[PDB]
Amino acid sequence: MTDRYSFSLTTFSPSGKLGQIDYALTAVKQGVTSLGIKATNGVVIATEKKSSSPLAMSETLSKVSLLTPDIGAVYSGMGPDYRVLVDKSRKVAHTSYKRIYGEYPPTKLLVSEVAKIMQEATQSGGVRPFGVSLLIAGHDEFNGFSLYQVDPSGSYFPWKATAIGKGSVAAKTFLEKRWNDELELEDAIHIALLTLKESVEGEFNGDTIELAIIGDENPDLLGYTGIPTDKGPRFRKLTSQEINDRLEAL
Amino acid sequence: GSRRYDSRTTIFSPEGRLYQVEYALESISHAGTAIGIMASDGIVLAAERKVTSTLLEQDTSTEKLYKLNDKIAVAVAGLTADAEILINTARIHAQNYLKTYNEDIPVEILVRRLSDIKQGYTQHGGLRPFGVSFIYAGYDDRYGYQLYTSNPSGNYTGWKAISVGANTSAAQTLLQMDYKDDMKVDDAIELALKTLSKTTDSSALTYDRLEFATIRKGANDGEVYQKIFKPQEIKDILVKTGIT
Amino acid sequence: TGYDLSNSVFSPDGRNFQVEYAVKAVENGTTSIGIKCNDGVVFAVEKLITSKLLVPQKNVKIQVVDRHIGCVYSGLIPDGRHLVNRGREEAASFKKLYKTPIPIPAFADRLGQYVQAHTLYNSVRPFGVSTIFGGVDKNGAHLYMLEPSGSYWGYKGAATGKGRQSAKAELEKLVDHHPEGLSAREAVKQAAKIIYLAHEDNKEKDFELEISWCSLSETNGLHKFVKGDLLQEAIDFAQKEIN
Amino acid sequence: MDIILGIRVQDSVILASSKAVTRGISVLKDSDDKTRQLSPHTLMSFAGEAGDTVQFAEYIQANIQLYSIREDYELSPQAVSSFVRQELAKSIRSRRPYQVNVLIGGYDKKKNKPELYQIDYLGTKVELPYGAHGYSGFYTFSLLDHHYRPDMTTEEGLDLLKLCVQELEKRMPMDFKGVIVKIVDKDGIRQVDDF
Amino acid sequence: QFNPYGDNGGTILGIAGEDFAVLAGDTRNITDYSINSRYEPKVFDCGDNIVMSANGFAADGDALVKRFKNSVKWYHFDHNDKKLSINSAARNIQHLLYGKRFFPYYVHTII
Amino acid sequence: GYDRHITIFSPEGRLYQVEYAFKATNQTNINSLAVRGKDCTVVISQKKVPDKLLDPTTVSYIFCISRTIGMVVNGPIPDARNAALRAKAEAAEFRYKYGYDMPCDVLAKRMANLSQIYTQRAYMRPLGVILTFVSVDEELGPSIYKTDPAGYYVGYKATATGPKQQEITTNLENHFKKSKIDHINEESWEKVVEFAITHMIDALGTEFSKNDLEVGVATKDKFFTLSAENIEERLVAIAEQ
Amino acid sequence: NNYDGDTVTFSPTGRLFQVEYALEAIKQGSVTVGLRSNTHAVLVALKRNADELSSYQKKIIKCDEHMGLSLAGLAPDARVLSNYLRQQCNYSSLVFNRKLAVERAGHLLCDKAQKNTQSYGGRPYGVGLLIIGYDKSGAHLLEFQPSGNVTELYGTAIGARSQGAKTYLERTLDTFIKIDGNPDELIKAGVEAISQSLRDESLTVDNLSIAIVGKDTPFTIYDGEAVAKYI
Amino acid sequence: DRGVSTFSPEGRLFQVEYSLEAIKLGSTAIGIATKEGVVLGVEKRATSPLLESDSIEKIVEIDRHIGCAMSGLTADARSMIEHARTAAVTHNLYYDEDINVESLTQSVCDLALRFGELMSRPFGVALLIAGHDADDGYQLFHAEPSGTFYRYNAKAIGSGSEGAQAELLNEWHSSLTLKEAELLVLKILKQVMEEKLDENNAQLSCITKQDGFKIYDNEKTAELIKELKEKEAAE
Amino acid sequence: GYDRALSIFSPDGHIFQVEYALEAVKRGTCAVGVKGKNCVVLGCERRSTLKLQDTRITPSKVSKIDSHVVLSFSGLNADSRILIEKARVEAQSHRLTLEDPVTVEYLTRYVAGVQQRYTQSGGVRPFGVSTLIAGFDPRDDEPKLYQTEPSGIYSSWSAQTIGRNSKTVREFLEKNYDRKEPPATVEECVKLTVRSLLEVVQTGAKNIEITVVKPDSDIVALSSEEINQYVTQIEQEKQE
Ligand SMILES: [Cl-]
Incomplete structure (x- = not known):
């Protein structure tokens, strides 16, 4: 018994390709479209909620996840792989940062830790790479707002705006025409909804779309009062009703 | 058992070559070119970003050039994720040395240890090697300015000028042509940019597809300064030499 | 293909061919049976007399676990002994912690989980035995049959080995003819008949009969x-029934 | 063990170390050299628990010699002293700590300066113009506070050292059987045979 | 606090002649002021014409004799039934005893 | 083609061992169904006992994980019991560590995470089972959460699993289109069980005796399975209407 | 064919080829015979040499004062298994002051061999053993196969051409079982048994190996001039 | 590929059988046992004339009463000799006596099958272990990577073994003197060796009760070579 | 831990991984060792496809193991660092326990033992390196030259070469080296070493390295001009 697979399952081919990473990226291509747009006073991340059955309650399945009060994540590819990555990402923000410095990590460093985890699944013994690409949006005091993409290889890149998954090629082109460096958060949400409608086929409403923002602090979502320096989470998930309000003036 | 699925990453070919090392070098040859040039009064590091998109955030980005300590930096060619694993190890190793001896680590010692780690992955453990080649640029009070390179085999060598990644054959011929020993930093800056501009697979070399850095003694009296160039500074240096 | 070369690999059907191959080793073995009765269980097995040189009564195949459970098996005999050794460890640790002797359903799952674990990895081989076992506990009598896959159920009567179909048919007649129940002493006699009837499928070498039993009244639950x-x-x- | 002294002057570091090895009511040896050359321009003297002293000294010696061969280069006195301090700082929280006190005298060839470091068994390091371990310091520090000048020659340093040994031979309870004196300068390490 | 040692009393005596040797010992076994047994032998034939007694704390004494008797058995198994000479037995017993140098067998041994 | 033997990616980004584990799910040829009432959650499954020598009382694919949580399995019994024992241990540990009963959805996530590991780690095969967890959660109310060999999981208004799952699924969809609500608007669990059996009969097109079915019911503070006579009592009520 | 790469793989007909190949190593081994009465048990073994300059490979090993075996196949594997038996016999004596029953000795060997047939990396033992002994229930003879199967017998034989001796003992069963209180006659029957497995070679003084254990006889081995009596 | 500890269909371990082929490629080593002592001789076989032949060490001391000769992958023998020496000295420490030659050989042979998936492969070297003890007198053993050892009156191993063994079959008798054995090893080595035999490319040694294990000088062997050539010409 | 037996026997009795490691040695740059009456000289080839090199900082081909012993090699450069490091550590460890520096034979025996261990240990491949180890034993004036190889065998040589085209330079040394009269001086020994490399090298510019070891820890490396003088002198005598 015991894990006898102590050798790498991802190896270089004669042409120099890393097969399993390429195949993992192919799995991401099949995945449902998700996107992210960076505004001057915030960031928006969005995706379609592909329901497996109409009897399924799609509210119980969250594709957009809070990692820290100021950082959120969305993905394209294999859902189960994403779910466990969110668990590990939430924990590493505490163990390797908050328990040391008494504050949450800046976006770039949390992204760096997730990237490390995904790189190790590319080299360690007896494992396949993660079959997901992540988009991580966040805010911190010294870097302001930022948006990152993390791929199965463990590589990460900062973006002004981007899309991943099914119709990413067309969605990226759409975002290039609309994005400028003066966009306000509400303008970015509007463009996000426009871009997503192109890739969505069936119903397009607040129940089939999942969307969250990184913006102003929300004292009402903190849960307590009395500490002036603690002002609340910048991450907020838009409600089904809040999405439909913006779909009328579309 | 599991024998069936073992690729055997650490074996010899009949010709006496290491399959996985050779294939990792083939991977690196498709990565963006990086150039190091050593002058008498400093070192230049220049690297080409891999085909950029217009919506990429250029200023808050790091892909090619990384800081190991205040006196040493590296240019990367290969898998970025693999490079960051090794960079963090190298950063820790430098601090271990400083903690032990109360002196900044000599460049070669850091390079040897990082190269020894790469070597290990080719001889034991059954894991794939790191698909990364480094250009090390640094200064210490023994040898002064130094350029090194290491590759997946764990072999390292010292250079006056060197390139890694794509089009090294063409790049090395151009560097070998115009380099001379009494060269200054500002001349080396020009040579680096001119070489990339001729070897690039792109249509034209622009500020948004480059990372740049210098290691001079151009601080105030007998001390070394690392300058990782900002986007606007690369735009200016590209105009100053008349490439754009 | 090649799906059958490694244990724990699913074929495109959703089957583990290595387990099905272990079943073939069980089908090759001698016949063994189990009969559930009024207040207990009876076990019997066919012992092929390969040679005159075998000492009669001295190659015992039925095994006891704890003091209240009996186990018999068909197929690779060493594999069966390994399973009983584990069963004895499981029963000992249960009694150690909980004081009471291990219940039969509890014991059945302990063997089941252990056998099932040998279908999860390619570094182990599945068990080459089907095991019939049971006994008496606080809730009465229980009879079980466990297969290489880890699959087990409760049984009114059970049979495995080369003469399983012959024995099964004979078992089904007893269940139909005795809806109220069979007595312990009757079940011992019937067990002998069924082994002799099941011997027709292995009739080159003549055989030696071996029987055991647990009964609340006849053996005091042991x-x-x-x-x-x-x-x-x-x-x-x-002998009277075959003629 | 017992008496180890050190004096840094203009161009050299001078170490003096007692020759006696006593166990119980018997002086077992009167010619013991309580020092090891770590590198051509670095000398370490030691005192403390029996066995521990030599074992530690030789362990440090082996490590510095290993470093020298690997890099084809001599570590600075400051670098060696920091390495030694860290080893003792590790040791003090071990199952059985090294009970060894050391002085490190070295000549830095890059700076062209003599350097004297005092390190105790806890890993307490200080750079000093003059140093001592054990009860010796209770006499020599005040003496050197009075007579020491920073610009003295090696000969002036040896006379200053004679004054310390004389004071110790007068007021110390135990017979330490004189000292072995060694000089560390630009030309390396040499022993004074007539002291 | 638990004391792992005890004293079982008794005394033993060995004398060697030209072509013979004797090993004697009393048969009394005690704890404190009480008699445990009037006949409890502590001189044993260990095979290969070697007699042995380990007197002091009887539990350690019995353990040692038991281990040496076993050592003779394995000496035969490993070295083609060769006879264990008295000098080789002596050296073997030294290693049995010194093996527990930091938790000793509390006995005085004679062979 | 060793990429079809262990859980690594194929050139088209697929995991064939996970896909073949899904096909093992239907090996038993049994269909299950789960629905929610106002106060309860009902799960029903077919019970096929082909051999006459079997003790029918020991043939079951419904498990009592905790006092509040029940679980029905679609797949081979060895893997089913493996999953059940782990779920029981996990639910027990949760209560000990965190001082309250493990919610149905949290246990579903935990078992889904374990399943995900088998899809990523090579030495462990996936379990060829689909696990349907049911309860009346103290916060969320009546709950149905389902796990598969891919490590996927989600909550359901109602659900079905097995070879003829699609027929049952659409049958339920059409009812909830009509009723316009998320559940069975009924007071007693007895009539929710009757609804479950009725709609399974219509979808599968077969009649059931008392021994052809298996029923599990979750109410506030307990999950329990029904006896043959409890089901017979339920079958009589359907027939007399 | 495709299913003989290791012991952890079953064939499509439910066979373990590595175990069968281990069984084959026994068939190539030199013949050895075992037989017993009610008072004594006897091993007889034909020893094999490399050439006329070499010694004759010893086949019989003592495990305790009351137990021992003979070997056919890989001799180092017999050394490992006999050493295990020596330890188990010894554990029983030191801990329980009890001579290990010959039946338990068989059960212990079975379980040790079995573990090597179900795990990856290992291999089956490549040797067969005939264990004789005298315990609280009289004389015994066991046959060990590296598949794990252990069998108690009145008499048997393993090795090359063992079928000749096995047939002879099957005929002689009623005679030799009642040779009680007579060691030399029980050996004579065993020496006549092993003679039915000889081809072109005959029993010489440095070729024959005999062992005996019984009621008032510790397990002892006879070689060299001590077996000249029986030729 | 396939397991390292795999059986062939004929009931033999592949790796053990393959290591036996490696030993056949090795240089010749011969041993002869007499009542006056045991002689051990080897072919040195230098690959090039620039190689200093006296550095070729294929005969080796284990203890004062036990010596050893090797053939095959001779680098593999180093850890076997190290074990043998430790086993011999350790036994003297535990028992205040010399260890039996057979017990030493058995201890070395216990290492042999300690390979698999312990070391990664069997040893690729065969050993001739010669010695004396009080119980069984002068002895010669052939230790193989199978874990098996035979006692021999005389034995040859290496490339010229089957030809040399057939020669030893005819020449050996139970009354050979030590001098007769010395000449016999030289004679048979000269027959099977490629290059012409002399004191630089062949080495002799012996073990006697009185003087223990001794490797002969090149001067001493040269005279035995000259004595051998003269005796063959003398009839 | 990774356990795979990578070095195993084949049907013909060869260990292919050990033999393929010898091919890596054959690919490496040529290295030669010649010992005189009172010295040993180690010569090394450096390939000239690499211009723009920095020779101050580039790892030298001959490494000091202790102040009295040196080690050169042919084969994988990265592999050689591991052997050199282990050798240097053993050198200091020997001085510490025995209170005497290693003999050249002992240091060689250790390095060879390490190489052998990597041929029958699980999860590792053999070293793709052969070494020449030269020096003088403590308080001894007799020159010592040893060779090791991936299999683990080692031996003493009057003169030896390893690496690419080593069979050509071995041929040269076999007819030009007299056992009865080794190079009597330092000059004679260096010249014979340079001559032997000139059979294979190309230009005698920055392609040849020479290191001379004399008794009592007297080791020095020759510069370009010093070596170039031997190259110039040899060519003028050749035109005859
Ligand atoms: Cl989890």
């Missing part, structure tokens, strides 16, 4: 081997 007068009486009953 596992005992059937020997001497009670054994010869059961053999004679079986």
Whole structure:
């Protein structure tokens, strides 16, 4: 018994390709479209909620996840792989940062830790790479707002705006025409909804779309009062009703 | 058992070559070119970003050039994720040395240890090697300015000028042509940019597809300064030499 | 293909061919049975007499676990012994922690989980035995049969080995003809008959009969081997029925 | 063990170390050299628990010699002293700590300066113009506070050292059987045979 | 606090002649002021014409004799039934005893 | 083609061992169904006992994980019991560590995470089972959460699993289109069980005796399975209407 | 064919080829015979040499004062298994002051061999053993196969051409079982048994190996001039 | 590929059988046992004339009463000799006596099958272990990577073994003197060796009760070579 | 831990991984060792496809193991660092326990033992390196030259070469080296070493390295001009 697979399952081919990473990226291509747009006073991340059955309650399945009060994540590819990555990402923000410095990590460093985890699944013994690409949006005091993409290889890149998954090629082109460096958060949400409608086929409403923002602090979502320096989470998930309000003036 | 699925990453070919090392070098040859040039009064590091998109955030980005300590930096060619694993190890190793001896680590010692780690992955453990080649640029009070390179085999060598990644054959011929020993930093800056501009697979070399850095003694009296160039500074240096 | 070369690999059907190959080793083995009765269980097995040189009564195949459970198996005999050794460890640790002797359903799952674990990895081989076992606990009598996959159920009667189909048919007749129940002493006699009837599928070499039983009234809820007068009486009953 | 002294002057570091090895009511040896050359321009003297002293000294010696061969280069006195301090700082929280006190005298060839470091068994390091371990310091520090000048020659340093040994031979309870004196300068390490 | 040692009393005596040797010992076994047994032998034939007694704390004494007797058995198994000479037995017993140098067998041994 | 033997990616980004584990799910040829009432959650499954020598009382694919949580399995019994024992241990540990009963959805996530590991780690095969967890959660109310060999999980208004799952699924969809609500608007669990059996009969097109079915019911503070006579009592009520 | 790469793989007909190949190593081994009465048990073994300059490979090993075995196949594997038996016999004596029953000795060997047939990396033992002994229930003879199967017998034989001796003992069963209180006659029967497995070679003084254990006889081995009596 | 500890269909371990082929490629080593002592001789076989032949060490001391000769992958023998020496000295420490030659050989042979998936492969070297003890007198053993050892009156191993063994079959008798054995090893080595035999490319040694294990000088062997050539010409 | 037996026997009795490691040695740059009456000289080839090199900082081909012993090699450069490091550590460890520096034979025996261990240990491949180890034993004036190889065998040589085209330079040394009269001086020994490399090298510019070891820890490396003088002198005598 015991894990006898102590050798790498991802190896270089004669042409120099890393097969399993390429195949993992192919799995991401099949995945449902998700996107992210960076505004001057915030960031928006969005995706379609592909329901497996109409009897399924799609509210119980969250594709957009809070990692820290100021950082959120969305993905394209294999859902189960994403779910466990969110668990590990939430924990590493505490163990390797908050328990040391008494504050949450800046976006770039949390992204760096997730990237490390995904790189190790590319080299360690007896494992396949993660079959997901992540988009991580966040805010911190010294870097302001930022948006990152993390791929199965463990590589990460900062973006002004981007899309991943099914119709990413067309969605990226759409975002290039609309994005400028003066966009306000509400303008970015509007463009996000426009871009997503192109890739969505069936119903397009607040129940089939999942969307969250990184913006102003929300004292009402903190849960307590009395500490002036603690002002609340910048991450907020838009409600089904809040999405439909913006779909009328579309 | 599991024998069936073992690729055997650490074996010899009949010709006496290491399959996985050779294939990792083939991977690196498709990565963006990086150039190091050593002058008498400093070192230049220049690297080409891999085909950029217009919506990429250029200023808050790091892909090619990384800081190991205040006196040493590296240019990367290969898998970025693999490079960051090794960079963090190298950063820790430098601090271990400083903690032990109360002196900044000599460049070669850091390079040897990082190269020894790469070597290990080719001889034991059954894991794939790191698909990364480094250009090390640094200064210490023994040898002064130094350029090194290491590759997946764990072999390292010292250079006056060197390139890694794509089009090294063409790049090395151009560097070998115009380099001379009494060269200054500002001349080396020009040579680096001119070489990339001729070897690039792109249509034209622009500020948004480059990372740049210098290691001079151009601080105030007998001390070394690392300058990782900002986007606007690369735009200016590209105009100053008349490439754009 | 090649899906059958490694344990724990799913074929495109959703099957583990290595387990199905272990079943073939069980089908090759000698016949063994189990009969559930009024207040207990009876076990019997066919022992092929390969040579005159085998010492009679001295190659015992039925095994006891704890003091209240009996186990018999068909297929690779060493594999069966390994399973019983584990069963004895499982029963010992249960009694150690909980004081009471291990219940039969509890014991059945302990073997089941252990056998199932040998279908999860390619570094182990599945068990080459089907095991019939049972006994008496606080809730009465229980009979079980466990297969290489880890699959087990409760049984009114059970059979495995080369003469399983012959024995099954004979078992089904007893269930139909006795809806109220079969007595312990009757089940011993019937067990002898069924082994003799199931021997027709292995009739080159002649055989030696071995029986054991647990009964609340007859053996006081403990596992005992059937020997001497009670054994010869059961053999004679079986001899009369084949002719 | 017992008496180890050190004096840094203009161009050299001078170490003096007692020759006696006593166990119980018997002086077992009167010519013991309580020092090891770590590198051509670095010398370490030691005192403390029996066995521990030599074992530690030789362990440090082996490590510095290993470093020298690997890099084809001599570590600075400051670098060696920091390495030694860290080893003792590790040791003090071990199952059985090294009970060894050391002085490190070295000549830095890059700076062209003598350097004297005092390190105790806890890993307490200080750079000093003059140093001592054990009860010796209770006499020599005040003496050197009075007579020491920073610009003295090697000969002036040896006379200053004679004054310390004389004071110790007068007021110390135990017979330490004189000292072995060694000089560390630009030309390396040499022993004074007539002291 | 638990004391792992005890004193079982008794005394033993060995004398060697030209072509013979004797090993004697009393048969009394005690704890404190009480008699445990009037006949409890502590001189044993260990095979290969070697007699042995380990007197002091009887539990350690019995353990040692038991281990040496076993050592003779394995000496035969490993070295083609060769006879264990008295000098080789002596050296073997030294290693049995010194093996527990930091938790000793509390006995005085004679062979 | 060793990429079809262990859980690594194929050139088209697929995991064939996970896909073949899904096909093992239907090996038993049994269909299950789960629905929610106002106060309860009902799960029903077919019970096929082909051999006459079997003790029918020991043939079951419904498990009592905790006092509040029940679980029905679609797949081979060895893997089913493996999953059940782990779920029981996990639910027990949760209560000990965190001082309250493990919610149905949290246990579903935990078992889904374990399943995900088998899809990523090579030495462990996936379990060829689909696990349907049911309860009346103290916060969320009546709950149905389902796990598969891919490590996927989600909550359901109602659900079905097995070879003829699609027929049952659409049958339920059409009812909830009509009723316009998320559940069975009924007071007693007895009539929710009757609804479950009725709609399974219509979808599968077969009649059931008392021994052809297996029923599990979750109410506030307990999950329990029904006896043959409890089901017979339920079958009589359907027939007399 | 495709299913003989290791012991952890079953064939499509439910066979373990590595175990069968281990069984084959026994068939190539030199013949050895075992037989018993009610008072004594006897091993007889034909020893094999490399050439006329070499010694004759010893086949019989003592495990305790009351137990021992003979070997056919890989001799180092017999050394490992006999050493295990020596330890188990010894554990029983030191801990329980009890001579290990010959039946338990068989059960212990079975379980040790079995573990090597179900795990990856290992291999089956490549040797067969005939264990004789005298315990609280009289004389015994066991046959060990590296598949794990252990069998108690009145008499048997393993190795090359063992079928000749096995047939002879099957005929002689009623005679030799009642040779009680007579060691030399029980050996004579065993020496006549092993003679039915000889081809072109005959029993010489440095070729024959005999062992005996019984009621008032510790397990002892006879070689060299001590077996000249029986030729 | 396939397991390292795999059986062939004929009931033999592949790796053990393959290591036996490696030993056949090795240089010749011969041993002869007499009542006056045991002689051990080897072919040195230098690959090039520039190689200093006296550095070729294929005969080796284990203890004062036990010596050893090797053939095959001779680098593999180093850890076997190290074990043998430690086993011999350790036994003297535990028992205040010399260890039996057979017990030493058995201890070395216990290492042999300690390979698999312990070391990664069997040893690729065969050993001739010669010695004396009080119980069984002068002895010669052939230790193989199978874990098996035979006692021999005389034995040859290496490339010229089957030809040399057939020669030893005819020449050996139970009354050979030590001098007769010395000449016999030289004679048979000269027959099977490729290059012409002399004191630089062949080495002799012996073990006697009185003087223990001794490797002969090149001067001493040269005279035995000259004595051998003269005796063959003398009839 | 990774356990795979990578070095195993084949049907013909060869260990292919050990033999393929010898091919890596054959690919490496040529290295030669010649010992005189009172010295040993180690010569090394450096390939000239690499211009723009920095020779101050580039790892030298001959490494000091202790102040009295040196080690050169042919084969994988990265592999050689591991052997050199282990050798240097053993050198200091020997001085510490025995209170005497290693003999050249002992240091060689250790390095060879390490190489052998990597041929029958699980999860590792053999070293793709052969070494020449030269020096003088403590308080001894007799020159010592040893060779090791991936299999683990080692031996003493009057003169030896390893690496690419080593069979050509071995041929040269076999007819030009007299056992009865080794190079009597330092000059004679260096010249014979340079001559032997000139059979294979190309230009005698920055392609040849020479290191001379004399008794009592007297080791020095020759510069370009010093070596170039031997190259110039040899060519003028050749035109005859
Ligand atoms: Cl989890």
